[PDB]
Amino acid sequence: FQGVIKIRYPDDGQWPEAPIDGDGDGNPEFYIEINPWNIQSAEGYAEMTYNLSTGVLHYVQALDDITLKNGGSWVHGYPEIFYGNKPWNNNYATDGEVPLPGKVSNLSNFYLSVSYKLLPKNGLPINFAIESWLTREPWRNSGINSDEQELMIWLYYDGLQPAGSKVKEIIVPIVVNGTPVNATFEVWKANIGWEYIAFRIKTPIKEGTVTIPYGAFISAAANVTSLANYTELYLEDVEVGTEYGTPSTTSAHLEWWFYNVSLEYRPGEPLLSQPPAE
Amino acid sequence: QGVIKIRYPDDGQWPEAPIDGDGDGNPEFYIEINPWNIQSAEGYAEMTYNLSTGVLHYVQALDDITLKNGGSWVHGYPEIFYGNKPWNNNYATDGEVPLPGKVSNLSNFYLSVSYKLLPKNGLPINFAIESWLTREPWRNSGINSDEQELMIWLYYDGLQPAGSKVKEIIVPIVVNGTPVNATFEVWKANIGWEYIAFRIKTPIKEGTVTIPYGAFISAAANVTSLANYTELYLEDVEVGTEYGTPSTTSAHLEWWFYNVSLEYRPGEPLLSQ
Ligand SMILES: [Ca+2]
Ligand SMILES: [Ca+2]
Ligand SMILES: [Cl-]
Ligand SMILES: [Cl-]
Numbered sequence: 001f002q003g004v005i006k007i008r009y010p011d012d013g014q015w016p017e018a019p020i021d022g023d024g025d026g027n028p029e030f031y032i033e034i035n036p037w038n039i040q041s042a043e044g045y046a047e048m049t050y051n052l053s054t055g056v057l058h059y060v061q062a063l064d065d066i067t068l069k070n071g072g073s074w075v076h077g078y079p080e081i082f083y084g085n086k087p088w089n090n091n092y093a094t095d096g097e098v099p100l101p102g103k104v105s106n107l108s109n110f111y112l113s114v115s116y117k118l119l120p121k122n123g124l125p126i127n128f129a130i131e132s133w134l135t136r137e138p139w140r141n142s143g144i145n146s147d148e149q150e151l152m153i154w155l156y157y158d159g160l161q162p163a164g165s166k167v168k169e170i171i172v173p174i175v176v177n178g179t180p181v182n183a184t185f186e187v188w189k190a191n192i193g194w195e196y197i198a199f200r201i202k203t204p205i206k207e208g209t210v211t212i213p214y215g216a217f218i219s220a221a222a223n224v225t226s227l228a229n230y231t232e233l234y235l236e237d238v239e240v241g242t243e244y245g246t247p248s249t250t251s252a253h254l255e256w257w258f259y260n261v262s263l264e265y266r267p268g269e270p271l272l273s274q275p276p277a278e
Numbered sequence: 279q280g281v282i283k284i285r286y287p288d289d290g291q292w293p294e295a296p297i298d299g300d301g302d303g304n305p306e307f308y309i310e311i312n313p314w315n316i317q318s319a320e321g322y323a324e325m326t327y328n329l330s331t332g333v334l335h336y337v338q339a340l341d342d343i344t345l346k347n348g349g350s351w352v353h354g355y356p357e358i359f360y361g362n363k364p365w366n367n368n369y370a371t372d373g374e375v376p377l378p379g380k381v382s383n384l385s386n387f388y389l390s391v392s393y394k395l396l397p398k399n400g401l402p403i404n405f406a407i408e409s410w411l412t413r414e415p416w417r418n419s420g421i422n423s424d425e426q427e428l429m430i431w432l433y434y435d436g437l438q439p440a441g442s443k444v445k446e447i448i449v450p451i452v453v454n455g456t457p458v459n460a461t462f463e464v465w466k467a468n469i470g471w472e473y474i475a476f477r478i479k480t481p482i483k484e485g486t487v488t489i490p491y492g493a494f495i496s497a498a499a500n501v502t503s504l505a506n507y508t509e510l511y512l513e514d515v516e517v518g519t520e521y522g523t524p525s526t527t528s529a530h531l532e533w534w535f536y537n538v539s540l541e542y543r544p545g546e547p548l549l550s551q
Contacts, residue, residue, distance in 0.1 A: 144420075
């Protein structure tokens, strides 16, 4: 009896995507993409289903004989669901609590909650990667420039390493399965035609419920940035997905569930605060 | 008499101009001061093209430079180029070589530059020829992950290419009329696109240098991790000087490009080995 929004690769082409619009206003609450952005040719399939009655996002992938677009780029793809304005295509989803896009100097704090269970097969290198783009303009569709930032938050990883160098270690208070815990994150800094900041947790979480304060990561990235006028940047979106694959990986079998992805806004509390504990 | 002058920071923060000697509307070349990583600075930068003599003269006297992306290392890239620049709306296609053209469709061509460099106070600079290779011919919005940045360094001082050195190659070039086998370091960085930089191991601060562009395109076709490399579009040929480091606050620079010339070779394939 469940209504389902299903996208499938390669049946739906090379960019399978669909908006999640329960209220039918034309502005989606979220946007799902299979996003195999580095897959150049592949045998097999990938499929993502969003259950409209239960809200669970399901993704099943069984790709073989992978040819990559840029072997340099390492990762094969990034199947995801995001809220906000994705700066890399024309998709957006702003029907939500947190006013994204918005300047980090004007934005208030918010908490991201995720409930998931990951199943990489045959030791496929994967991660659970929350990522955000910070651009000089609010409604970007053409990509990222050198004076802009990519902010990543890795909640799980296996056989995968962030770009650049580990420059710091911070401690962010998060909630894992209802219990609050002081989590240590590795602060990785790469410069790849834009500033790349990745916060890799030291204890990967393969399944469960994790809630994080986003402002703790925005302030930490502000604390290590090499960008001028950081606070003038527009926080574009919050993307939640799983990177996977390496240049030496020709088969990528993967399945996971996102039982919930939600963002609670905190009006009045500043998003930019002091740096987290070291 | 007859001088095209662009200046910084007077003509805004993107001082640029076409070079249209015959006034037909299509530029033969395009000049940009291009201080793309400069957020704030004091002083001036001036680029002058004498249409009568054909010499390009660049004077720069910048101080208290605050970088826009410190991790991007360099401050800018004052340049002249032919073809289609993918990072803005500028283009210049009144010339022999059909740029932008597909790599598998294009013929070979030789690039000649005669120049003299004057970095002041040990300012880290290079003499960098660079080209972009995109999927669509008329790009104006940037570069994607499945595209390439190709660089050829004829001179450098205190500057190192991005990424890491992969190997060295031999390319036959002509220096001051004498043909010579030059050795280039092949540097490979993957920074949101593929970045290939051919840095000569004997830097040349002044003189005339002629290079075969097909030698570098074919070499890049050999080290690339991009699929369907031959289907990319050779966007343009950019000739300029990168300069500066994150710790560089004062950057004084002067150079002359006495000639920038392209000779097409119809019927001669661009790709070979
Ligand atoms: Ca809606
Ligand atoms: Ca003309
Ligand atoms: Cl398609
Ligand atoms: Cl705003």
